[PDB]
Design a protein around this ligand. Structure first.
Ligand SMILES: Nc1ncnc2c1ncn2[C@@H]1O[C@H](COP(=O)(O)OP(=O)(O)OP(=O)(O)O)[C@@H](O)[C@H]1O
Ligand SMILES: Nc1ncnc2c1ncn2[C@@H]1O[C@H](COP(=O)(O)OP(=O)(O)OP(=O)(O)O)[C@@H](O)[C@H]1O
Ligand SMILES: Cc1cn([C@H]2C[C@H](O)[C@@H](COP(=O)(O)OP(=O)(O)OP(=O)(O)O)O2)c(=O)[nH]c1=O
Ligand SMILES: [Mg+2]
Ligand SMILES: [Mg+2]
Ligand SMILES: [Mn+2]
Ligand SMILES: [Mn+2]
Ligand SMILES: [Mn+2]
Ligand SMILES: [Mn+2]
Lengths: 683, 289, 289, 683
């Protein structure tokens, strides 16, 4: 057992009835005195290091060639002047095991934290030394964290794509299904998580070229996609991850759900394909009134109306579908379906729940399309247009496939530096740069939507960490007040930066003129409701920072009207799995699952306390499972009212609560305006 | 007074070896000496044989002769555990740790090992001697079954527990602990049924039944000593295992309502360290807040 | 070629009565007529009585005479499901819907019923006639078992499935559907074991075994028609139940590797809504001609 | 039970110790006087029938519009003038259950045998009334039988494709793999059996752009193809059938074979994809000498040499592969691999065996490409060039994917009519028409190869029927002499028709100039060896027909040199599974499996005696399993010497014989020049 691992395991050993949290710090020192410095490759000067990394195909020549060597050296010096120290052993371990650049033999460390941050900053700035230094100060203060793809791969020649969330629309044809399989394989090859909408696909027992009972339904397509994702597994590094979304009014919805049951046969169950269910308000109304619902055959609806079932508003179309004899449908019990969803989420955490009307009643780009499905993490909610992939030697009709750009603000570090505006604007600029530098040659609709929509996702993390280190309970009304104010400022500065980029470049996102930003509707609740903190403690937390008022929001609305907005979507709160360790932050805006988490690496045990955990804030670091899920829903809705896309919202349940409690949480989330529900993790 | 609570306990203990991933033991297995691996394989093979016969023969035959649908349901469940869960788990362990030839060789070794054949001959002979409506032949087979559950398995259980207690082979060890947890309740249950029959007898008949039980225990014990030496001498543990089997022999006697027969001894402390969701319907009030 | 696959499918279908809450059935039970309640009770008792024979005799007797450790384990698992899961499930349904005195009377009636007794005793007679080391008598019992699992239960299953397909008695209907799903796989598995014996026979012996199977099917079928009219005429369903019996008779025959006996018929849509060559090394000079 | 069913079952009820074969005839009468005539749909005249079939989308109106109604009436009258009668109940039953056109609800019969033959002939003639009458006389005499796709689908609006088999080359890339999956689904949707060569795909543990041990090998692609064929299953009517072919020198050859082991795990086992193994002469030489062989990693060979492993001759490059340190290889025992092949074929009948050198030593188009794999029935052996399917928005390099049209000569009817020449030429014309009117819009390489190669497959059926009905034992040397003469005549007249078509159209197949037809090498054995019958009985059988001599072959060689050949490939002997029933013929050139076959249809059982079976020819109808497989190999080699493509050669084995006997049969087949071995069916 290594010395740093012993020093880390000494945390659980209680002295005077208290955990030895400070010992973790010592572990970090050991982890750097015994391992990191010994296995870190050192060079006589930075010029030699850069030459070795470029020549050995570690870095890219293009992004480094935009700067003189003096500017690169100045950026590296700015990164190293902070003298950044990892506060916990797990932060440094996760960085140097997951993100630090290693030799081809994987035994030496080529990149420190400062080196990786400097390289990512130089990639972000695209030739501006001052902008690169600003990015270096942003990331070394740990105010902003690029996502795992961006942080890991920026500036590296041997790399995947910087985007890892991809949403694909699948049209109801064999050509479109095969193209979707191909694109899923190509994007999993790039290292991205792929979500596919299967609602347009006709159900099982439908007609193919006017022969009856011929379609295999969406379950056969799910089997094909599951095989494709198993095959494309990042060159045998990570398990291929894919998601399939189906509307709850699709007839296959039960069989869809049956793919996640344990009792399902081998020809029914898909193991590497996550599933999500899109639930329109009509289904919730039918379940609430206990009226029996109807699941429709999509192809009959398409033949009758010329549009797909998921392309029209089910609230106004459901009665017409039911009363139409030419539309084929099957009787179901919506309450039984809700109970089945709750039971499946209890067993396996699936499916993801998308409340379609909750997403689309605040969607700014409904003119382009309504949000029909979400991503693999159930937080990307954007307009998508299906593509018509025709036969060979025939021109395809390329639509819009969602691929947003991830990046997370560290709420604790951002707010302690009183730099919400600067961090949000710099993160928006970096996300815009990464979106502009993304070029996928095997996903035509993804590339077209990236060029047109210019959608980015700016998330936040360390919400619970910040609240606990400031003596605020996550379920307290003060925490929701802080979340409201902080995320309203984040939205304000994100919109301001998007409008500034649109003014500078002279271009907005495609079909912006029809958006609620152009019409000013988006700013309605912002020009009438003041989002300043209602509690003195939160106001003192925001001291030293200008909180945008209704007049500021009116000025921003006028600015957007005059200049437009560059990004169709700006904010989405991703789970932030492993980057939260490196940043010493709690994951996403979720409450912490455990105060101290026990992990097993190799044959060794390691202990990660939550950041800033001590005896004084032990009570404020309440575990997520012990919390009331209604108050967690309230906080997530408070944040969601300022996020244009969704939030990865995992439910944290105890083994005691039943499926009725899960359904109640889901229905309260639907009532409170929650757009997506990610997971049902049972303790 | 007890079958219902045993029924509930047995069904709530239900498990499958596939619930436990075994690839984590690969390295601690690789690191053991050839002598240690040999003893380990053979030990589990001896256990597999016992569970094979307990599942195929012992539990079903006792189920056939015991009256009452609930008693039969418990015994049928225990029988299923023996051959569908326990015996199979050993193959899961073998298939993970050992190459096919070593697996083939150890199963050939059980067929030709004289102590393992003798103990199977004795136990299965008593099972097959049960006569319909003859409670004495049934008692004798139940004593044999308790001795299999609570005594005979333990020369085998020692070694996985010995490793588990040192933090070695812990996934295999987890399986073994689940098996042991089952056998403990199986031995108690069959013990209670045996006591029912014993308590119906005259004092003279009881005296003969105690003689039968003690003579059988001694005969099995003497054979188990030779088996233990044969397996454990190469790993230096025979004396320690012998203390463990005597300890468990006393537990078997106690399960039968008899006084302990062997004196207490200190057991290796390492071995001692080795030891769907509920559904409610949705009310109309759950849709309003 | 098949036992490990069936092992997997069996164990992954494991379930317990407690998982389904039964009390909410009283909200539709109270709205049925006397004839509907009477038929349901009688059908339920019929299924219960037949399934008890399968748990106490049918599965354990086949497990006893079949050779092969893995087959014995699968058969033990199936016997466990009959005794520990199915029997408790039927009891639970009864206790929910009827008071104790009503349950006792229904079982008294069904116990004396001529058509239920005829089929129950015909099946049990074949199980009692199995002789040690006689594969012909074993095959005949397997045929009887397949006929029970895949055919005789279905005149009974019809009614719960009929309600289940209409939105009535949904909790007990869910239980019945799980039971039926187990009996389906039991019938298929025992069918494969019977075909194995059948395929070891001469052509004359095969023709003789086919005649046995068809003759037995005919006797059971003619009694099923009478059983059906006796229970279902009072609720007007007998015509459709008869179609369901023939459809399931054909499945039972196919399980035994035989051709369907009855013409194909459509089933009531409400019920539908409810529903190694010797390896010899190359010796050289085999490459030259 | 139906009356005809009882009459057919009356065959096995022996009278005076003899089977009642004549009862079969009675059955047909019953089957027509009680079922077919009552279930047929009669119109006032042919005009109303044709109009009803055209407007109700049963027939394509284009092919019927090329004839005036008087010509169509004359063709139908020619078809009905023969007064064709089905001699057995099963012939009529199979036609009216599998090939006769029925209504949309399949309650009535719209097409008689004469109607189907007339429609197929009118489609074949393409506006020529005299040619249509010639086709009608050819098919009503049952001299020629179009394949099941062509016979069933010709002239139908709801038809699929007329091509039976498709062969795809899969390049070693994710884009090519995805395109192969798409094309396989498209062609299975069209109803054709798809064969894919997986020998170019790099093995398991190869590098995908410098990251090693990343590839899943051919087994992952096999699983993808298996799921694709499961999904595309002819709209749920016929199970999707695919074939995968791998060279025996591929490193994955064991894992490939492990896909068919009965003990294979679910993550490896493949159940709807047939497997074939391509064995060069080098492997047989290594196994014969007992020298340990080496299987190779295709990607290392491609990197070192610039060509794929299966793209070059292993007999000359195996030593270079072994001695090259930059080529990665694994040691295997070739005799153990042969024994594994024999064991697998005993257990499941797989893999198909393709003796590559036997195919390519007489292959006429080696200049275009060597034959690297076969079709799903292991009788199509043609040159194929792999396609380079590039990224989206990049032009793809379209290669040649094999596809040929099947058609079988009925040997008994052809020789009874003494019309080998006329039948062969008319069948060649019909297959040329089928190729010309075939246009597949989703398989580009298949379309290009169909347009360029112009390859057709002209098979033969009722070899054993003709031999047994003429008192010739199938294993006798007289039978092999008859096969030699008959198939030399078939080859002569097929080459003559191909050259005549090339002359009349002024065009040959692509790259004909480099073929052995152009250089005259192909005719060598035909201009030096006489293939006239060596037995007086066979010569009498061939009386009334001009058997080509060496002078006729020299004249044909000169004619080909002057005019060229229209078809790259002309003759391939398919299994001819179910269409042999309608023609009252034994399946293909294979010996009969059983004299009387008991088949279960519905709840009834039927007995089909072999065509012409009686007391006097009972022992001439020797069952295949009772025959010496060495003499069957001799027969198949004798036929194969005159067939440019392969023959679907099924091995018929007894349960008593060992895997050593199967290996001996395989090695004797390789020694005798057998190109492919189809199945190892054990009694
Ligand atoms: N907690 C830590 N986080 C990150 N790096 C660390 C940490 N502890 C030590 N290091 C690394 O080890 C070096 C030694 O740091 P130490 O605590 O011994 O003193 P120092 O005054 O920071 O040293 P130096 O002269 O290297 O700057 C640091 O410069 C840094 O590179
Ligand atoms: N074996 C058969 N094959 C094909 N069609 C048949 C067969 N048997 C009967 N039919 C059809 O059924 C009709 C019944 O007539 P059948 O053969 O009994 O003689 P028919 O009335 O004297 O006239 P004909 O033989 O001249 O058609 C035939 O005309 C024919 O259309
Ligand atoms: C992407 C991917 C490829 N492969 C294998 C199958 C293909 O035959 C093979 C080639 O993939 P390619 O698509 O050719 O990958 P590449 O072009 O980026 O890499 P290279 O330059 O080396 O050609 O890699 C996998 O096994 N799994 C995967 O996920
Ligand atoms: Mg379409
Ligand atoms: Mg490539
Ligand atoms: Mn046990
Ligand atoms: Mn036990
Ligand atoms: Mn049962
Ligand atoms: Mn059963």
């Amino acid at each position: 057992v290594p010395k740093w691992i012993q020093l880390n395991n000494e945390i659980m050993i209680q002295k005077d009835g208290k955990f030895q949290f400070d010992k973790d710090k010592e572990a970090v020192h050991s982890y750097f005195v015994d391992y990191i410095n010994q296995n870190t490759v050192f060079f006589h000067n930075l010029k030699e290091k850069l030459d070795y990394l470029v020549e050995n195909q570690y870095y890219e020549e293009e992004f480094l060639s935009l700067y003189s060597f003096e500017d690169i050296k100045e950026v590296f010096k700015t990164a190293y002047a902070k003298k950044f120290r990892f506060p916990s052993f797990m932060s440094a371990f996760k960085f140097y095991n997951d993100y630090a650049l290693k030799t081809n033999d994987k035994k030496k460390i080529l990149e420190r934290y400062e080196d990786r941050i400097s390289i990512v900053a130089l990639f972000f700035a695209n030739g501006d030394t001052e902008k690169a230094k600003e990015y270096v100060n942003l990331m070394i203060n740990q105010e902003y964290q690029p996502s795992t793809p961006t942080f890991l791969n920026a500036g590296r020649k041997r790399r995947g794509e910087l985007v890892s969330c991809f949403l694909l629309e699948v049209n109801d044809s064999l050509n479109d299904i095969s193209r979707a399989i191909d694109i899923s394989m190509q994007l999993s090859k790039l290292g991205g998580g792929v979500s596919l909408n299967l609602s347009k696909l006709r159900a099982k027992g439908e007609a193919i070229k006017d022969v009856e009972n011929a379609t295999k339904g969406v379950v056969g397509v799910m089997k094909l996609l599951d095989n494709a994702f198993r095959y494309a597994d990042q060159m045998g590094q990570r398990q291929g991850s894919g998601a399939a979304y189906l509307n709850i009014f699709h007839r296959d919805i039960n069989d869809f759900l049956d793919t996640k049951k344990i009792s399902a046969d081998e020809d029914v169950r898909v193991k590497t394909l996550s599933i999500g269910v899109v639930i329109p308000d009509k289904f919730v109304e039918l379940a609430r009134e206990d009226k029996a619902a109807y699941v429709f055959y999509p192809h009959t609806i398409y033949k009758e109306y010329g549009q797909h079932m998921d392309e029209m508003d089910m609230n106004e179309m459901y009665d017409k579908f039911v009363d139409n004899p030419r539309v084929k449908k099957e009787k179901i019990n919506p309450r039984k379906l809700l109970e089945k969803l709750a039971m499946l989420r209890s067993e396996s955490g699936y499916p993801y729940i998308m409340f379609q009307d909750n997403v689309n009643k605040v969607h700014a780009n409904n003119h382009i399309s309504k949000v029909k499905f979400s991503n693999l993490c159930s937080e990307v909610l954007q307009a998508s247009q299906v593509s018509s992939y025709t036969d060979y030697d025939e021109e395809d009709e390329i639509g819009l496939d969602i691929s947003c750009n991830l990046g997370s603000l560290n709420i604790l570090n951002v707010m302690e530096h009183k730099s919400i505006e600067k961090t949000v604007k710099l993160a928006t600029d970096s996300l815009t740069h990464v979106s502009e530098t993304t070029d996928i040659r095997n996903a035509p609709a993804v590339r077209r939507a990236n060029k047109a929509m210019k959608s980015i996702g700016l998330g936040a993390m360390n919400l619970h960490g910040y609240l606990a280190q400031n003596g605020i309970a996550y379920e307290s009304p003060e925490a929701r007040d802080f979340a409201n104010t902080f995320f309203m400022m984040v939205n304000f500065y994100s919109i301001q930066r998007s409008a500034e980029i649109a003014k500078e470049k002279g271009e907005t996102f495609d079909q912006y003129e029809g958006s609620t930003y152009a019409t000013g509707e988006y700013f309605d609740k912002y020009v009438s409701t003041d989002f300043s903190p209602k509690y003195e403690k939160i106001a003192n937390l925001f001291e030293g920072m200008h909180i945008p008022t209704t007049e500021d929001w009116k000025k921003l609305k006028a600015f957007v009207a005059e200049h437009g907005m560059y990004h169709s979507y700006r904010l989405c709160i991703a789970p932030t799995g492993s980057i939260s360790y490196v940043q010493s932050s709690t994951a996403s805006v979720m409450p912490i699952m455990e105060r101290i988490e026990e992990r097993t690496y190799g044959n060794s045990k390691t202990y990660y306390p939550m950041p800033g955990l001590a005896s004084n804030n032990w009570f404020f670091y309440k575990e997520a499972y012990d919390m009331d899920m209604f108050k967690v829903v309230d906080m997530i809705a408070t944040i969601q009212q300022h996020i244009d896309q969704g939030i990865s919202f995992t439910l944290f349940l105890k083994d005691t609560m039943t499926t009725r409690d899960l359904n109640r949480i889901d229905l309260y989330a639907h009532h409170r305006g929650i757009k997506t529900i990610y997971y049902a993790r049972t303790k | 007074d007890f079958t219902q609570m045993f029924y509930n306990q047995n069904v709530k203990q239900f498990w499958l070896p596939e619930e436990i991933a075994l690839n984590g033991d690969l390295l601690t297995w690789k690191y053991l000496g050839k002598n240690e691996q040999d003893t380990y394989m053979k030990v589990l093979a001896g256990l597999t044989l016992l569970d094979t016969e307990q599942g195929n023969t012992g539990m079903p035959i006792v189920a056939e002769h015991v009256d009452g649908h609930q008693r039969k349901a418990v015994l049928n469940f225990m029988a299923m555990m023996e051959n569908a869960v326990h015996a199979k788990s050993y193959s899961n362990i073998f298939m993970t740790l050992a190459p096919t030839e070593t697996i083939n060789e150890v199963f050939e070794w059980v067929k030709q090992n004289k102590y393992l054949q003798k103990k199977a001959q004795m136990i299965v002979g008593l099972y097959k001697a049960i006569q319909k409506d003859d409670e004495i032949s049934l008692f004798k087979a139940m004593v044999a079954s308790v001795y299999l559950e609570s005594f005979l398995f333990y020369s085998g259980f020692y070694y996985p527990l010995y490793f588990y207690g040192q933090g070695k082979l812990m996934q295999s060890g987890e399986i073994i602990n689940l098996i042991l947890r089952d056998e403990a309740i199986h031995g108690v249950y069959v013990g209670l049924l045996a006591q029912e029959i014993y308590n119906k007898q005259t004092e003279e008949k009881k005296a003969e039944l105690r003689e039968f039980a003690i003579d059988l225990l001694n005969q099995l014990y003497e054979n188990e000593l030779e088996y233990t030496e044969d397996l454990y001498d190469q790993v230096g543990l025979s004396h320690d295992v012998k203390k463990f089997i005597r300890y468990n022999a006393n537990k078997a006697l106690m399960n039968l309502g008899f006084d302990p027969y062997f004196e207490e001894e200190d057991i290796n402390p390492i071995v001692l360290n080795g030891l769907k969701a509920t559904v409610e319907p949705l009310k109309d009030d759950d849709f309003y807040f």
